[PDB]
Amino acid sequence: PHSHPALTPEQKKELSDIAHRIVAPGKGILAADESTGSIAKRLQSIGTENTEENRRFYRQLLLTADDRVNPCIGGVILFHETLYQKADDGRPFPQVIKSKGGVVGIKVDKGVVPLAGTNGETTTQGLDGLSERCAQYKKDGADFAKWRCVLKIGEHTPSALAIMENANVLARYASICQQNGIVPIVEPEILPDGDHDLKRCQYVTEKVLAAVYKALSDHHIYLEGTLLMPNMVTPGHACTQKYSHEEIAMATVTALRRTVPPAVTGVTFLSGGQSEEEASINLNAINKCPLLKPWALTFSYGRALQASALKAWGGKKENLKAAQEEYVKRALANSLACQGKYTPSGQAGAAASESLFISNHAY
Amino acid sequence: PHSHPALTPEQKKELSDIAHRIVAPGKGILAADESTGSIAKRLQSIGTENTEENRRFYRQLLLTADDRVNPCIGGVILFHETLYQKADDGRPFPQVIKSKGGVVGIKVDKGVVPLAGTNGETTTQGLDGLSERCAQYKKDGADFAKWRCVLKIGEHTPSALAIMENANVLARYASICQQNGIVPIVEPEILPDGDHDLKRCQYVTEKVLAAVYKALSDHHIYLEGTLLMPNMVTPGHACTQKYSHEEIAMATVTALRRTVPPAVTGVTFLSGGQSEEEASINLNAINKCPLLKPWALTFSYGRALQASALKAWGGKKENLKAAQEEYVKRALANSLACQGKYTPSGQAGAAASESLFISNHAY
Amino acid sequence: PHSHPALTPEQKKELSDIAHRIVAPGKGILAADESTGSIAKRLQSIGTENTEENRRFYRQLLLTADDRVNPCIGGVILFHETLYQKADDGRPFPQVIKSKGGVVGIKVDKGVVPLAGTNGETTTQGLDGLSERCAQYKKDGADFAKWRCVLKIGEHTPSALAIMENANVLARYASICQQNGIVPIVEPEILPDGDHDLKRCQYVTEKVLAAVYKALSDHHIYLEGTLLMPNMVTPGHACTQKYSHEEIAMATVTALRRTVPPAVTGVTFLSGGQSEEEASINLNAINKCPLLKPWALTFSYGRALQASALKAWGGKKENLKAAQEEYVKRALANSLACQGKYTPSGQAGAAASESLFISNHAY
Amino acid sequence: PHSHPALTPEQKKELSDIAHRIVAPGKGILAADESTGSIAKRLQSIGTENTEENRRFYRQLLLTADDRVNPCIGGVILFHETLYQKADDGRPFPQVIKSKGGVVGIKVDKGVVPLAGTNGETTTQGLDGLSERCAQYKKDGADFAKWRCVLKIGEHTPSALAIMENANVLARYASICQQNGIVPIVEPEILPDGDHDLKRCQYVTEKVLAAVYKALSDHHIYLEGTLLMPNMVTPGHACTQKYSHEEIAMATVTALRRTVPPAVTGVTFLSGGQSEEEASINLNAINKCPLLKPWALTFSYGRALQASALKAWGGKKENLKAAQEEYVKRALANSLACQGKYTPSGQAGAAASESLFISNHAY
């Protein structure tokens, strides 16, 4: 019942300012923080050898795209390796990002581990020495971080244990980040795997996010200096029932309104298994949803910003600009989407929508 | 991990519609739900015998005030006795309230009880047979309810037990209400008693409200079909440090933004120990606070609507109009305040731009 | 982190002394606390009208059995009505019980109520005015109380909510009892309904009991002044797999060893749907289990003490001694069983072998 | 509500067997797991350079003490460095320990870290890669582990956060250990620092241990395959009120009886700031306490086994035998103490047919 402030007013201002820069109007996040193991599958899909130089070149391709991406990209999440790589002109990648108006982010979790006594559920590791890592990352140009927890919808999952433990470890990570001037992006990802329907995803998302914010409260987290990186509320990948984008938008915004305090500066959706176009259309629908939304609703996209660029590249240096063009097209699309101004087939305000239509009490 | 819906879409729509009517723009709540024991000391202060007829006459005085109060009063909380009393013309008081555009409320708790093993802390009783009581009250014209929990700021309070238990019983009460078509007002009152400062009240309010909304989540409460009735965030009564109304406002709105999901339809402040004018000025400042506020911010006032009326009445029938005039004046003032339009002058403002120097990172 | 003792050393001694008397070696509890609704249909089973007089006569039959029962019966749980009834000789039933060396107990819960948003789960009501009720019951000769919570094993049950809420209300009930010199018997009954196996029941019993004792800790309950009244660990009623009494004993004792602190004075098993003979044999096996058991392991039997007596009586005054004889046979058997000294031989009636199981039909 | 067994029966039997060997009658644990940083001040106290060789020689001195220690020492906790060192004759230290009948243990935490927003409270780190470390340690001869959490009694401490978080991380550590055939010793140390009295230590110890065992339950920990390493319940170092060894014993055993399930195989007390003789006398009083104690109550002593030996050694190879003799004397003393047969003076005793005491409800 007694306060022992975790942060000074100055520390709070720093975190809040960073958080707001990342999700400024029209801006979102490029999630480029795939580990060597994670990106292996991406490079194999284009017959490209998973070498440090090819990883460097691919990240260079994204980070040095032309200035059209600048008002689209408020932040870039990097993997450790990339944080210490340089572009062809000798500039460290953090400097490249900053010169284009982006905030530099660093993924700091050390992956998932199995929870014994559960049906294949996990928590996430990475807290050991995290404070010192954050202090160093801060010095080396990073101002925010990312940590991924993974939950699965199944017959008996997510379990009480999995929800409580993942919420708790997210809070520890967030606490340590804020002590070191790093804005934590809290990523409690509920996988879309399975044949569950939209209502079930909405229910599980509501319960998971309630647990997350109670844990953040218990650990004295300054919400204004955080971002949330959740799944959209969608049917399961194998669900037999089909839904519209407006229904997905309504389920998502309702789940967030029921759980995320207004003090949270922004929500930066992960794209999950969604295609590039699907992720953009859904984000647009979310931003056109006629409910009050007291936080930025924008993107933290990996595959949904990268899929076409990677394919266009094909591992060939001669395809640089063609690949970059595909990335710029998705950056532009999603920048419009996070303002509710994205039209898929067109561009000239040729997308009129629905009002006075549909109950929000079915959600 | 599996939903077993507490409410149908139709039940949800009913609750949401009621909650929104209560806190519609310009409207707040008259809290007239004092028990015989509670109002006794109020009648003694004006030398009036605490009889059923004098209580009836007093409640009639408030409820039958002229039509100027109609746009000011969205709801009226009654004590059980009053719910079944009639005006002089034979009209049930609920009908009187409804004819003036008000929603009828009923207090359903059975008072506080001591928590053993604590330093004088309490929980609140009243769950037994509550469902049947709610069904009866609904039939007899009530559409919302009130339940008061009380917490104290002290050397060791509020304790973990007190916070958890009061949050839990509020959730049970809210669950039972919603099963019977009654909108629950959740009232976790943190008393202003003591010499603690503004920061301490804000800290405790934040921890209490986080506990409250986690419990409501655990018990499957439909937030859109609820209201919150909290203390404003103020220094303790015996605090020597002085604060402006803008500081009280910032602390209050900050605490709510950090804990209350946007889905909550409205916040209806209790006036506590504040004077009539103090309570209007603070509510107005709260509504002028330049942060995003995704819920109605209005009043649920007892003393702050009734004090001058009670005094002007003095127990004398000939002072009816004078007493009513005092009540009407406070209803008008607070109707303005809950829109941020209260000026100490007779409805005359437009001096709305002269705010500059206060950090929200100091809160 | 600061103690505010709920109880004085004198209060602790009184409660500890009472608890130990109830479960003194060789002794158990007659659970005769069936409400009018509960006792009604068994009275129907022998064509007897459910009148106050017939209920009184039946209770007299049990309570005034000959002195062979005295060393078997440490306590008797009464329903409110019976607490204020008198034997034919004018003696209040509490006086009758005490004169035979028994402690008088009173059931104080007010039945189960549905938890909204669950699959047919309940919590239990009865806290309102419980303190005053306990003080009065204490004056009128009761020294312990009973409160029944009910949980069910199913695909999604018991849920996190049901476990937490039932554990919490048990703790509130225990707290209030101990403030008034009443030893609370904590009864978290996990129903045997369903086709689950022994392992599943053991798992659920362990999770439920861990929740119960954490809640009792949080609410500052003095464990030495309590008793526990749980289900034995058994397969579900409809389980096809067969188990020995030694396996039932091992699962039961293991579940308790993993969850019940040694400070708990005694465990008084409910018989659930077991026959008179099965309940005795299992209790015997439990006491013979070769693991360390730092609490009394005895009976709190209703039907399993009463079935043969009720049938032998048949509602006929002339069959008094015959009926009493059946009850005495069962008290003696279970007195031996709670010492691990019961061997059946020559020979219990067919009434003592028939399943006493009725499905829990809120359905 | 559904079991997904963390362990097979075979895995359980292995863990239980190990746990029981460590705390077999008359046996305790030598805690020799000081890090380089931790042992530094003790080597300085005898003017000895903190080098790997001097550390090796000192550990060798302890581990190769003569065979009188064999029936006294059921286990030895090593620091990582020491697990991979060899005696002069080339035998790995794990082989030395095992040949004398001891189980080899390994400390696996990575020290305390500050909890932001608290008054100087900590949690403990070390989960990252812990599974792989445990598998490696198992292969390299360790069968149990130790993990130290630290809590402090102060005006506002231990806080709800600190208790919750330390209990949770202890449970994670325990889970990972048991997946790898390693018995976890759970060490929630409440420091003796401060001027608090015996009752306060007892209260905090009860609350901490209740939290620890709820967390172990939530994480599916197999208690029979664990040990507990708690503080004894004592007044704070600066407390002016004086207590007898019998009062310390009663408070300690009462606290454990109220919180530690019988299934826990043993309690191995840390000696904290107690002197060699004090720690032995208190352990003896604990084992003579006339309450039922369903777990082994023995020692896990660092300083209380090493102080005189370290002093006699003085960093001088020439003092090997003298130093070993001091260690052997404390090993003998504590073996008697954990059997309740230690007399604090020289040679003459054994006339005890003791223990069934007057006081009990003052605690």
Coordinates of C-alpha atoms in Angstrom, one line a residue, chain A residues 184-328:
Chain A
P184 CA 9.3 -2.8 -23.8
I185 CA 7.0 -4.1 -26.5
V186 CA 4.9 -6.7 -24.7
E187 CA 4.1 -9.6 -27.2
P188 CA 1.7 -12.2 -25.8
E189 CA 1.1 -14.0 -29.1
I190 CA -1.9 -16.3 -29.2
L191 CA -1.3 -18.6 -32.2
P192 CA -4.0 -18.9 -34.8
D193 CA -3.3 -22.7 -35.0
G194 CA -6.4 -24.9 -35.0
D195 CA -10.1 -25.0 -36.0
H196 CA -11.5 -22.8 -33.2
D197 CA -13.8 -20.0 -34.2
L198 CA -13.7 -16.2 -33.8
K199 CA -15.6 -16.1 -30.5
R200 CA -13.2 -18.5 -28.9
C201 CA -10.2 -16.5 -30.0
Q202 CA -11.9 -13.4 -28.7
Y203 CA -12.5 -15.1 -25.3
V204 CA -9.0 -16.4 -25.0
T205 CA -7.5 -13.0 -26.1
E206 CA -9.6 -11.2 -23.4
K207 CA -8.5 -13.6 -20.7
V208 CA -4.9 -13.4 -21.7
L209 CA -4.8 -9.6 -21.9
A210 CA -6.5 -9.2 -18.5
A211 CA -3.8 -11.4 -17.0
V212 CA -1.1 -9.5 -18.8
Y213 CA -2.2 -6.1 -17.5
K214 CA -2.8 -7.3 -13.9
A215 CA 0.8 -8.7 -14.0
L216 CA 2.1 -5.4 -15.4
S217 CA 0.3 -3.6 -12.5
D218 CA 1.7 -6.0 -9.9
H219 CA 5.2 -5.4 -11.2
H220 CA 4.8 -1.6 -11.2
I221 CA 5.1 -1.2 -15.0
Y222 CA 4.6 2.3 -16.4
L223 CA 2.1 1.6 -19.2
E224 CA 2.6 4.9 -21.0
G225 CA 6.2 3.7 -21.6
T226 CA 5.0 0.4 -23.2
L227 CA 3.5 -0.9 -26.4
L228 CA 1.4 -4.0 -26.8
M229 CA 2.0 -6.4 -29.7
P230 CA -0.9 -8.9 -29.8
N231 CA -2.5 -11.2 -32.3
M232 CA -5.5 -9.8 -34.0
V233 CA -8.7 -11.6 -33.0
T234 CA -9.3 -14.0 -35.8
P235 CA -10.8 -17.5 -36.4
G236 CA -8.3 -20.3 -36.2
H237 CA -6.3 -21.1 -39.4
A238 CA -8.4 -24.3 -40.0
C239 CA -11.8 -23.0 -38.8
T240 CA -14.6 -24.2 -41.0
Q241 CA -16.8 -21.1 -40.3
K242 CA -15.9 -18.1 -42.4
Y243 CA -15.9 -14.4 -41.4
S244 CA -15.7 -10.9 -42.8
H245 CA -12.9 -8.4 -42.2
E246 CA -15.5 -6.2 -40.3
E247 CA -16.2 -9.1 -37.9
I248 CA -12.5 -9.6 -37.3
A249 CA -12.1 -5.9 -36.7
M250 CA -15.1 -5.8 -34.3
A251 CA -13.9 -8.9 -32.4
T252 CA -10.3 -7.4 -32.1
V253 CA -11.3 -3.9 -31.1
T254 CA -13.9 -5.2 -28.6
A255 CA -11.3 -7.5 -27.0
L256 CA -8.8 -4.7 -26.6
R257 CA -11.4 -2.2 -25.3
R258 CA -12.3 -4.8 -22.6
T259 CA -8.7 -5.3 -21.4
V260 CA -6.2 -2.7 -22.4
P261 CA -6.0 0.5 -20.2
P262 CA -6.1 3.8 -22.1
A263 CA -2.7 4.6 -20.7
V264 CA -1.1 2.1 -23.1
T265 CA 0.5 4.2 -25.8
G266 CA 0.0 1.9 -28.7
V267 CA -1.0 -1.5 -30.0
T268 CA 1.2 -2.8 -32.8
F269 CA -0.4 -6.0 -34.3
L270 CA 1.6 -9.0 -35.3
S271 CA 0.6 -10.4 -38.7
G272 CA 0.9 -14.0 -37.7
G273 CA 0.0 -16.2 -40.7
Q274 CA -1.8 -13.5 -42.6
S275 CA -0.9 -12.7 -46.1
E276 CA 0.5 -9.2 -46.9
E277 CA -2.9 -8.0 -48.3
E278 CA -4.9 -9.7 -45.6
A279 CA -2.9 -8.0 -42.8
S280 CA -3.3 -4.6 -44.4
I281 CA -7.1 -5.0 -45.0
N282 CA -7.7 -6.2 -41.4
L283 CA -5.6 -3.3 -39.9
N284 CA -7.6 -0.9 -42.0
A285 CA -10.9 -2.5 -40.8
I286 CA -9.7 -2.3 -37.3
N287 CA -9.0 1.4 -37.7
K288 CA -12.4 2.0 -39.3
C289 CA -14.2 0.2 -36.5
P290 CA -16.8 2.7 -35.1
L291 CA -15.9 2.1 -31.4
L292 CA -13.7 4.5 -29.3
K293 CA -10.1 3.4 -29.5
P294 CA -7.8 5.3 -27.0
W295 CA -4.5 4.0 -28.3
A296 CA -2.7 3.9 -31.7
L297 CA -3.7 0.8 -33.6
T298 CA -0.9 0.0 -36.0
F299 CA 1.4 -2.7 -37.3
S300 CA 4.4 -4.7 -36.1
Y301 CA 4.8 -6.8 -39.2
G302 CA 7.5 -9.2 -40.3
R303 CA 6.2 -11.5 -43.1
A304 CA 3.4 -9.0 -44.0
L305 CA 6.0 -6.4 -44.8
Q306 CA 8.7 -8.8 -46.2
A307 CA 7.1 -11.6 -48.2
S308 CA 7.1 -10.1 -51.6
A309 CA 10.4 -8.3 -51.2
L310 CA 12.2 -11.6 -50.2
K311 CA 10.7 -13.3 -53.3
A312 CA 11.6 -10.4 -55.7
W313 CA 15.1 -10.5 -54.3
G314 CA 15.6 -14.2 -54.8
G315 CA 19.1 -14.0 -53.4
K316 CA 20.3 -12.1 -56.4
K317 CA 22.1 -8.7 -56.0
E318 CA 20.7 -7.6 -59.4
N319 CA 17.2 -7.7 -58.0
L320 CA 17.8 -5.2 -55.1
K321 CA 15.5 -2.3 -56.2
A322 CA 12.8 -4.6 -57.4
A323 CA 12.8 -6.3 -54.0
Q324 CA 12.9 -2.9 -52.2
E325 CA 9.9 -1.7 -54.3
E326 CA 7.8 -4.6 -53.0
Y327 CA 8.7 -3.6 -49.4
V328 CA 7.9 0.0 -50.1

